[PDB]
Design a binder for these strands. Structure first.
Ligand code: K
Ligand code: K
Ligand code: K
Ligand code: K
Ligand code: K
Ligand code: K
Ligand code: K
Ligand code: K
Ligand code: K
Ligand code: K
Ligand code: K
Ligand code: K
Ligand code: K
Ligand code: K
Ligand code: K
Ligand code: K
Ligand code: K
Ligand code: K
Ligand code: K
Ligand code: K
Ligand code: K
Ligand code: MG
Ligand code: MG
Ligand code: MG
Ligand code: MG
Ligand code: MG
Ligand code: MG
Ligand code: MG
Ligand code: MG
Ligand code: MG
Ligand code: MG
Ligand code: MG
Ligand code: MG
Ligand code: MG
Ligand code: MG
Ligand code: MG
Ligand code: MG
Ligand code: MG
Ligand code: MG
Ligand code: MG
Ligand code: MG
Ligand code: MG
Ligand code: MG
Ligand code: MG
Ligand code: MG
Ligand code: MG
Ligand code: MG
Ligand code: MG
Lengths: 117, 70, 88, 55, 103, 271
RNA sequence: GUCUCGUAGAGGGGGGUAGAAUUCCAGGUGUAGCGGUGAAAUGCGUAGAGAUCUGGAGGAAUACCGGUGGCGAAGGCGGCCCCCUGGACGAAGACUGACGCUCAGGUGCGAAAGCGUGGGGAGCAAACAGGAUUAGAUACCCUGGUAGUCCACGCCGUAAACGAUGUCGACUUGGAGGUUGUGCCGGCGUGGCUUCCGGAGCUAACGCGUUAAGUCGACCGCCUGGGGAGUACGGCCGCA
RNA sequence: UGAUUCAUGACUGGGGUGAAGUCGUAACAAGGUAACCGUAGGGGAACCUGCGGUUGGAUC
């Protein structure tokens, strides 16, 4: 119920889903939406469109906070890397900064075995 | 990839820049390469194949500037 | 492993003069010095197999030089193994 | 000879994210590319240079 | 008698101890017939990344020629001194006296 | 060293000895000896209160200095010795003022080594300091639990304690059990590990070797009659009940710690 | 073959340390999903997950550099720092004077898996369990997961351990590169190792082609139709 | 009292040949999960799975 105006949007863009979480500048979450909970399952959930719908719903969940400015942190290789950012600017927020925070091990742990499909 | 949108810079211009800084970092190719484990014999096999292809293709290109098609 | 000073000392003690680095006695004494010096390294590093290959080459190189000296001048051979403390 | 202290020169051979730039792009000789990589890795340990840009 | 290059970084809150630490160390090299080829005080610099949550540190660079034994002792001093947050000892081919690129 | 016996008789075939050529071969230091007669596991009501204890070899008690509070005076190790009373070896040390004492022998300690205790002692195996003055991450043994009380933790052969953190008046320790335990930082500890780590590699080899150590046979409860033990009874080998102690308490997982007074010091139980 | 001076190198053994990431633990914010697939379900989540922030614990591996690049007898070797240590190469000389080449038997080294004892265990994952797919599915796919992978010491002695090409030496047109020395005045030479093409010649052909599968010499190993069979029996070795 | 050799033995191990009945479809094309080597575990069977290795893999 306290105003913030300066938040941070975190985009978790995996191959199967997109999670959008808006926090303040200290990491405290204010609201979230996901492509899977916006009415899409299966092959529809892992699309750029479903990611866009999630970005809108997240913008609505935090409209009480009076957020005006956003930094954007994108994480992952999924199809919702760009449509979520496009929708966050179309939602009225002023996109101040865009950053990739995808984790990269500097070697790290052995990955799972290759799939034989 | 840290794109600071500067003043008066429209959003689309910043969006195309961030995309450029990502591709120039190879983050997407690096993530896709780390999704599953590649046996060291497999890594060596495909490093050699890419070098044989880079070479044998250039050597045919030289033989295609010294020949007429019609 | 042998330093320059230690090497030069051996050349003077077993050679004809200061730059007789090639005589059989000098070579055998030089190999003997490195073999003995490396015994302390391999007492601590028993699994240093790669270095030990170099040591075993010194041992076989010394054996061949000794067998040559013994075939040429037995007297020089007897003196040499006595000064160095070798069984044969 | 390359110096891990000579930070101004080293910055020419690292990307914006901090990665060492390939010698095929900077046109560096192979023998000196190996000295650059060693120097850059020492500077990173001394915190004269970053490991990754998200610092 | 080999040539070494020593860099150590001091907790900024103990900056007032650096001139004392410097004298104590070189006294240990000199007292063992070792020489000091170069000694620079870089002061507080911004760290490229945080160390122990810090963001700055006081750098010192020396170049000495000492026996391995006193250098082994110097490194024991660094490890157990809480003010020294990071150090680095390197062999050098020859003595280095010219001014470093920091100064 | 760990030495297998040759099978010249059935009682020798499986014996494995721990042979240490550095232990003193003569008699112990007499001014630090006391008599210590045996109990058979019986208390002052004359009742057996711990089963399976009796007999074994006569043993003299060696007075061991667990407090290590002779500060500022160096001591030199004179010899290592066998101590029948414990798994660790002990070391006879001579202080500069001419006093001799026994200490637990740390790993690596040998005759001629120098040791010291106090706030200003060097960080070396065998030296004793308040844990306030010992670097976090160090390996220590013979750790006090209350300042001045004397060492009580990590005294057995090959054991040690890790100082994992230091917060205010307390340090956090990882014990051999796996427990994480808080102890006052003013409590002392000795650097290094208790020696004689090969102790656990010995193999007794025969029944009599346990009898030499004062251990009497264990009779299984299922081999008894019902009047003797909850497990007793049966025509043939029968069981059919949840395993319990001779006094009826479950003995395969039921926890028995109940000390609310010291709960505040256990950061994390061993499991 | 020895000595002198220097050069490059993931060559080996020992110790220390750094940053990224995964997992786990604690706490803050926050709320209905997460995860997974071809689609699902098992699984996880209102007992507050997933997401996000802070702190801690621990193990393993070292992004970029990085390269038909380098080193090593082969197997193999990749962050940084120190300590111990092997080999190779070059330039000028000096020294020894055939001291050489090959090698049955013998001895040593020898990936991964596996075995023994003691540790360690994040991630991965034989076996195993469940969910799917299917006519079935003791699989491929999904969710989990134990040996094992890691460390110390010992054993085992095998791999398409391959260039499917034994070691050493001499000789015989060329072209373009890589890498590492060195001489001379970017230019001209001269050494080492290495990649691709191709001439004569060779080859059943494919191809090889100065790093030969060309032309010769020295010594060793090995083959003699397919199956039975690298099996049986015996010996030796091994804890198996 | 041993050694060696020949004959024979309830039962049992795998092998060859014939014939084709039953069960599947492992390999040959990318053989529909690239194949194969060593090793280990599992499975009515061909085999499957892990770890390292090879190209004597198609596509790119
Ligand atoms: K004892
Ligand atoms: K019993
Ligand atoms: K019973
Ligand atoms: K009974
Ligand atoms: K009975
Ligand atoms: K070296
Ligand atoms: K042989
Ligand atoms: K798994
Ligand atoms: K089917
Ligand atoms: K496991
Ligand atoms: K084996
Ligand atoms: K090969
Ligand atoms: K060259
Ligand atoms: K040249
Ligand atoms: K041969
Ligand atoms: K076994
Ligand atoms: K018979
Ligand atoms: K198959
Ligand atoms: K195939
Ligand atoms: K297999
Ligand atoms: K069956
Ligand atoms: Mg997966
Ligand atoms: Mg030599
Ligand atoms: Mg008992
Ligand atoms: Mg007792
Ligand atoms: Mg018992
Ligand atoms: Mg009875
Ligand atoms: Mg009863
Ligand atoms: Mg019965
Ligand atoms: Mg029954
Ligand atoms: Mg293994
Ligand atoms: Mg087994
Ligand atoms: Mg094992
Ligand atoms: Mg084990
Ligand atoms: Mg699985
Ligand atoms: Mg074979
Ligand atoms: Mg190989
Ligand atoms: Mg190969
Ligand atoms: Mg072969
Ligand atoms: Mg050719
Ligand atoms: Mg032929
Ligand atoms: Mg056989
Ligand atoms: Mg064997
Ligand atoms: Mg098939
Ligand atoms: Mg197939
Ligand atoms: Mg076989
Ligand atoms: Mg299976
Ligand atoms: Mg599988």
């Amino acid at each position: 119920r306290k105003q913030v105006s300066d938040g941070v949007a975190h985009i978790h863009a995996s191959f199967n889903n997109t999670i959008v979480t808006i926090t303040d500048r200290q990491g405290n979450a204010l609201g979230w939406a996901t492509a899977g909970g916006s009415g899409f399952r299966g092959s529809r959930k892992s699309t750029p469109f479903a990611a866009q719908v999630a970005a809108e719903r997240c913008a609505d969940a935090v409209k009480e906070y009076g957020i005006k400015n956003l930094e954007v942190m994108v994480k992952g290789p999924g199809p919702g890397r760009e449509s979520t950012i496009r929708a966050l600017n179309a939602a009225g927020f002023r996109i101040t900064n865009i950053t990739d925070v995808t984790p990269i091990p500097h070697x790290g742990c052995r990955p799972p075995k290759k799939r034989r499909v | 990839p840290v794109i600071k949108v500067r003043e008066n810079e429209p959003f689309d211009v910043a969006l195309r820049r961030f995309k450029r800084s990502c591709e120039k970092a190879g983050v997407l190719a690096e993530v896709r390469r780390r999704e599953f484990y590649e046996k060291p014999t497999t890594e060596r096999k495909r490093a050699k194949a890419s070098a044989v292809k880079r070479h044998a293709k250039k050597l045919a290109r030289e033989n295609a500037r010294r020949t007429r098609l019609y | 492993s042998l330093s320059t000073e230690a090497t030069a000392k051996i050349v003077s003690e077993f050679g004809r003069d200061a730059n007789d680095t090639g005589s059989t006695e000098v070579q055998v004494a030089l190999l003997t010095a490195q073999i003995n010096h490396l015994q302390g390294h391999f007492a601590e590093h028993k699994k240093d197999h790669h270095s030990r290959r170099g040591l075993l080459r010194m041992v076989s190189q010394r054996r061949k030089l000794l067998d040559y000296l013994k075939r040429k001048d037995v007297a020089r051979y007897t003196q040499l193994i006595e000064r160095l403390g070798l069984r044969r | 000879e390359i110096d891990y202290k000579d930070i101004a020169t080293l910055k020419n051979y690292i990307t914006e994210s901090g990665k060492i730039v390939p010698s095929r792009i900077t046109g560096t000789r192979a023998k000196y590319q190996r000295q650059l990589a060693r120097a850059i890795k020492r500077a990173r340990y001394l915190s004269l240079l970053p490991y990754t840009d998200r610092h | 008698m080999r040539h070494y290059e020593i860099v150590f970084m001091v907790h900024p809150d103990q900056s007032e101890q650096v001139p004392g630490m410097i004298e104590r160390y070189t006294a240990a090299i000199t007292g063992a017939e070792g020489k000091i080829h170069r000694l620079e005080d870089w002061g507080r610099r911004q760290l490229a990344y945080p160390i122990n949550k810090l963001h700055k540190a006081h750098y010192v660079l020396m170049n000495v020629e000492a026996p391995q034994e006193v250098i082994d002792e110097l490194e024991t001093t660094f490890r157990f001194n809480d003010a020294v947050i990071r150090s680095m000892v390197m062999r050098t081919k020859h003595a280095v006296t010219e001014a470093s690129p920091m100064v | 060293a760990v030495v297998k016996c040759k099978p010249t008789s059935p009682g020798r075939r499986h014996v494995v000895k721990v042979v240490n050529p550095e232990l003193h071969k003569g008699k112990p230091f007499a001014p630090l000896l006391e008599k210590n007669s045996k109990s058979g596991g019986r208390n002052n009501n004359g009742r057996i209160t711990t089963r399976h204890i009796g007999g074994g070899h006569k043993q003299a008690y060696r007075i061991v200095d667990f407090k290590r509070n002779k500060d500022g005076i160096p001591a030199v190790v004179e010899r290592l010795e066998y101590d029948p009373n414990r798994s660790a070896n002990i070391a006879l040390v001579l202080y500069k003022d001419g006093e001799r004492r026994y200490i637990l022998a740390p790993k690596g300690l040998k005759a001629g080594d120098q040791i010291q205790s106090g706030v200003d002692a060097a960080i070396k195996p065998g030296n004793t300091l308040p844990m306030r003055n010992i670097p976090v991450g160090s390996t220590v043994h013979n750790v006090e639990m209350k300042p001045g009380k004397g060492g009580q933790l990590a005294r057995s052969a090959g054991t040690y304690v890790q100082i994992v953190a230091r917060d205010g008046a307390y340090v956090t320790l990882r014990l051999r059990s796996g427990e994480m335990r808080k102890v006052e930082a003013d409590c002392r500890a000795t650097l290094g590990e208790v020696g004689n780590a090969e102790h656990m590699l010995r193999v007794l080899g025969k029944a009599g070797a346990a009898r030499w150590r004062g251990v009497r046979p264990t009779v299984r409860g299922t081999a008894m009659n019902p009047v003797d033990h909850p497990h007793g009874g049966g025509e043939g080998r029968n069981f059919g009940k949840h395993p319990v102690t001779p006094w009826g308490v479950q003995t395969k997982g039921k926890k028995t710690r109940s000390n609310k007074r010291t709960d505040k010091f256990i950061v994390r139980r061993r499991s």
